[PDB]
Design an enzyme around this catalytic site. Structure first.
Site, mmCIF file in Angstrom:
data_model
loop_
_atom_site.group_PDB
_atom_site.id
_atom_site.type_symbol
_atom_site.label_atom_id
_atom_site.label_comp_id
_atom_site.label_asym_id
_atom_site.label_seq_id
_atom_site.Cartn_x
_atom_site.Cartn_y
_atom_site.Cartn_z
ATOM 1 N N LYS A 155 34.518 31.105 52.149
ATOM 2 C CA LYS A 155 35.272 31.816 51.134
ATOM 3 C C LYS A 155 34.869 31.421 49.729
ATOM 4 O O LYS A 155 35.741 31.259 48.888
ATOM 5 C CB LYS A 155 36.769 31.511 51.284
ATOM 6 C CG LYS A 155 37.361 31.956 52.595
ATOM 7 C CD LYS A 155 38.779 31.384 52.734
ATOM 8 C CE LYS A 155 38.747 29.883 52.956
ATOM 9 N NZ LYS A 155 39.979 29.388 53.585
ATOM 10 N N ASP A 191 44.556 25.886 58.506
ATOM 11 C CA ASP A 191 45.760 26.737 58.162
ATOM 12 C C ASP A 191 46.305 27.533 59.360
ATOM 13 O O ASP A 191 47.504 27.668 59.530
ATOM 14 C CB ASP A 191 45.554 27.657 56.935
ATOM 15 C CG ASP A 191 44.233 28.428 56.934
ATOM 16 O OD1 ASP A 191 43.425 28.134 57.793
ATOM 17 O OD2 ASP A 191 44.010 29.387 56.099
HETATM 18 O O1 LIG Z 1 41.965 30.628 55.517
HETATM 19 C C1 LIG Z 1 41.674 31.437 56.614
HETATM 20 C C2 LIG Z 1 40.372 30.919 57.191
HETATM 21 O O2 LIG Z 1 39.346 31.087 56.286
HETATM 22 C C3 LIG Z 1 38.032 30.877 56.735
HETATM 23 O O3 LIG Z 1 37.810 31.706 57.884
HETATM 24 C C4 LIG Z 1 37.902 29.401 57.051
HETATM 25 O O4 LIG Z 1 36.575 29.069 57.494
HETATM 26 C C5 LIG Z 1 38.967 29.084 58.061
HETATM 27 O O5 LIG Z 1 38.842 27.765 58.424
HETATM 28 C C6 LIG Z 1 40.400 29.456 57.639
HETATM 29 O O6 LIG Z 1 41.287 29.296 58.772
#
Ligand SMILES: OC[C@H]1O[C@H](O)[C@H](O)[C@@H](O)[C@@H]1O
Ligand SMILES: O=C(Nc1ccc(Cl)cn1)[C@H](COCCO)Oc1ncnc2c1cnn2-c1ccccc1Cl
Ligand code: NA
Length: 443
Positions: A155, A191
């Protein structure tokens, strides 16, 4: 015809039942690849063990701090577990400057530690030393509940000196560099996992967590025998799928469009998180922009005229997509307004149709992954009809006017032998890190 040539272009975003079924089954096969020792290392879908285990209910009573990092925006929380059981929370929000996200890891973690310091001053508790849970929303190879190596940023994060390093160590080192307070970092979770645990606290049939936010990911409870990376057969463990990387071994090639490749080529991480690039809030606003620039350079939108804001990457913010979509043409009129544009009444409609095309494809793509997870769990058990609860969090799923309804209905058509209950996390990504910490402390 004017309108039909536009629909032809927009129509490419459609996914048939069969497409979604095909995507789903392939997800299940990548899941299985990520779980097995033989194929795990080459798996696009990494199925990372979290050390969060099914266990008798309960935790320590007391105060617990949590931090939640997963975006530019993040959160510190004080959670009080009391006993029959009650959980009460206090939060503050902090916004991270670009400087702190694209410099070093030390800089990022010093900012973070400055924020914690602020939180504690404002809650008259800087002199207390508490257990802390850390929701850290990036791919991490866990070695235990309180130790994990950052595999890679996602991200758009770039902080240097972090990848390959123990993220808990970086938190502690920053806390100690500041020397202004003390905390025992006792747990670090994704998360998804935090959302699942917060949800589980409310409803013990909650065994899946999903985020559709800036990014998109899920976790679920796996039988230990299927978790070949961790010795033991008894009970269950949460697996962080990192399904965002689905498609990174070519699994989605047939579905990808011109605008997808372009979002990918100009992203901070080209060739990675492709499935996530179809869905997450980081990218959905940009896909839309790129579509409008196709409909402008087809002379089919804004009488062929596009502003400087629209020529520039990032200008169509995912929040705009959400607003556009939320019948008198007034919000649409007043997102476009600022972007230096003059919708006919027809452009308002077109823009809305584009937003809706990109958003609908996201809910449908997303639904196939979750159906896969859910249908795999059903199949692993002794269910005609599996009742399951899914904890969900994220700004796309919560705030996006109809993303959620489209997602629900698509999910349900693909899981004809499950009855699913969605629990929308109020602050689960943060609360769950405290609750895991409280359970860790019990041992
Ligand atoms: O934040 C939502 C998700 O974002 C991306 O996919 C991250 O790599 C992941 O670890 C997290 O759970
Ligand atoms: O936290 C958990 N496991 C865990 C935690 C730490 C460590 Cl080291 C290992 N496993 C388990 C995982 O459950 C997933 C669903 O099957 O979550 C929980 N385990 C026990 N009590 C739990 C939870 C979540 N809420 N509660 C809970 C219930 C009542 C009061 C306080 C809490 Cl808090
Ligand atoms: Na195992």
């Amino acid at each position: 015809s004017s309108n039909s040539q536009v629909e032809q272009i927009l129509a490419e975003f459609q996914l048939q039942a069969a497409d979604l079924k095909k995507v789903m089954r392939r997800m299940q096969k990548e899941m299985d690849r990520g779980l097995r020792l033989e194929t795990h290392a080459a798996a696009s879908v990494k199925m990372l063990p979290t050390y969060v285990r099914s266990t008798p209910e309960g935790s320590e009573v007391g105060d617990f701090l949590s931090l939640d990092l997963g975006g530019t925006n993040f959160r510190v929380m004080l959670v009080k577990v009391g006993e029959q059981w009650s959980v009460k929370t206090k939060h503050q929000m902090y916004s991270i400057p670009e400087d702190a996200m694209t410099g070093t890891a030390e800089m990022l973690f010093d900012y973070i530690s400055e924020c914690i310091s602020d939180f504690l001053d404002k809650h008259q508790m800087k002199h207390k030393k508490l257990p802390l849970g850390f929701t850290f929303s990036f791919p991490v190879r866990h070695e235990d509940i309180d130790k994990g190596i950052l595999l890679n940023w996602t991200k758009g994060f770039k902080a240097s000196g972090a990848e390959g390093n123990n993220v808990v160590g970086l938190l502690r080192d920053a806390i100690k560099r500041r020397g202004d307070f003390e905390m025992d970092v006792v747990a670090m979770v994704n998360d998804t996992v935090a959302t699942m645990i917060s949800c589980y606290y409310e409803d013990h049939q909650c065994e899946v967590g999903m985020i559709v936010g800036t990014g998109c990911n899920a976790c679920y409870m796996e039988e230990m025998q299927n978790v070949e990376l961790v010795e033991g057969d008894e009970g269950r463990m949460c697996v962080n799928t990192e399904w965002g990387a689905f498609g990174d071994s070519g699994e989605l090639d047939e579905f990808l469009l011109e605008y997808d490749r372009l979002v990918d080529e100009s992203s901070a991480n080209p060739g990675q998180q492709l499935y996530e690039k179809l869905i997450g809030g980081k990218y959905m606003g940009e896909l839309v922009r790129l579509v409008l620039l196709r409909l402008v350079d087809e002379n089919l939108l804004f009488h062929g005229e596009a502003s400087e804001q629209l020529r520039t990457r990032g200008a169509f913010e995912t929040r705009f997509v959400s607003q556009v979509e939320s019948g008198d043409r007034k919000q649409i009129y007043n997102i476009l307004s600022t972007l230096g544009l003059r919708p006919s009444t027809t452009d308002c409609d077109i823009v809305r149709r584009a937003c809706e095309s990109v958003s609908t494809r996201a809910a449908h793509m997303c639904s196939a992954g979750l159906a896969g997870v859910i249908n795999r769990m059903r199949e692993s058990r002794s269910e005609d009809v599996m009742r399951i609860t899914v904890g969900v969090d994220g700004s796309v799923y919560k705030l996006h006017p109809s993303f959620k309804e489209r997602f629900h209905a698509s999910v349900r058509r693909l899981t004809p032998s499950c009855e699913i209950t969605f629990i929308e996390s109020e602050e689960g990504s943060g609360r769950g890190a405290a609750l895991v910490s409280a359970v860790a402390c019990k041992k």
